[PDB]
Design a protein around this ligand. Structure first.
Ligand SMILES: CC(C)CN(C[C@@H](O)[C@H](Cc1ccccc1)NC(=O)O[C@H]1CCOC1)S(=O)(=O)c1ccc(N)cc1
Ligand SMILES: [Cl-]
Ligand SMILES: [Cl-]
Ligand SMILES: [Cl-]
Ligand code: NA
Lengths: 99, 99
């Protein structure tokens, strides 16, 4: 679709067999989701921005369906205020910002 | 333009006669720029980011150019990792997400 920016660009995602609402975020390097279980290995990471940093778990090679479009990549998991689809997965669904 | 997301969507902005680099950030409700001098009165605002809520200064009706596109709107000033062009100004310039 073409999504305007009058309101937050929220979509439904499917991750880890769960449905979640998430923000399509061109300002986020990497996808970060609220606490949930994911399979496989992980390693700790710190990410930061407005308000400072949080500690997350980095899981690689995770499949997320994003508004009906499947994509695989790294998913960070931790105490994010909002679920965020970042550039690492936006690229895979062919998302662009147009003006 | 059509901006892909393989790298950060950084553009040049012009504010206060000066060129600066800024990030086109669909996950940011608001535009926030690093400390600088802007004209007029300001009002307080709280904004939330990944690490928590912070206080910033809100300036209204500020002239700003974004990638050559003229805008006039609200600019926040405060402790910010990067200059952020958020949805208030992305909407002005006609930016949409597309996939
Ligand atoms: C600040 C940018 C440069 C980076 N962030 C993305 C931003 O879109 C961020 C997303 C968000 C929205 C609402 C609550 C919390 C976070 N919005 C944001 O702070 O909105 C403020 C600034 C003005 O308007 C309000 S991030 O969340 O720190 C981040 C960092 C690393 C990763 N991998 C993922 C996310
Ligand atoms: Cl990735
Ligand atoms: Cl591409
Ligand atoms: Cl505005
Ligand atoms: Na993995």
């Amino acid at each position: 679709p073409q999504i305007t920016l009058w309101k937050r660009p929220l979509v439904t995602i499917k991750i880890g067999g769960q449905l979640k609402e998430a923000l399509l975020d061109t300002g986020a390097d990497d996808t970060v989701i609220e606490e949930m279980s994911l399979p496989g290995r992980w390693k700790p990471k710190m990410i930061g921005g407005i308000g400072g940093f949080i500690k997350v778990r980095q899981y690689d090679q995770i499949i997320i369906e994003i508004a009906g479009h499947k994509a695989i990549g790294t998913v960070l998991v931790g105490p994010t205020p909002v679920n965020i689809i970042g550039r690492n997965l936006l690229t895979q669904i062919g998302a662009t910002l147009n003006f």
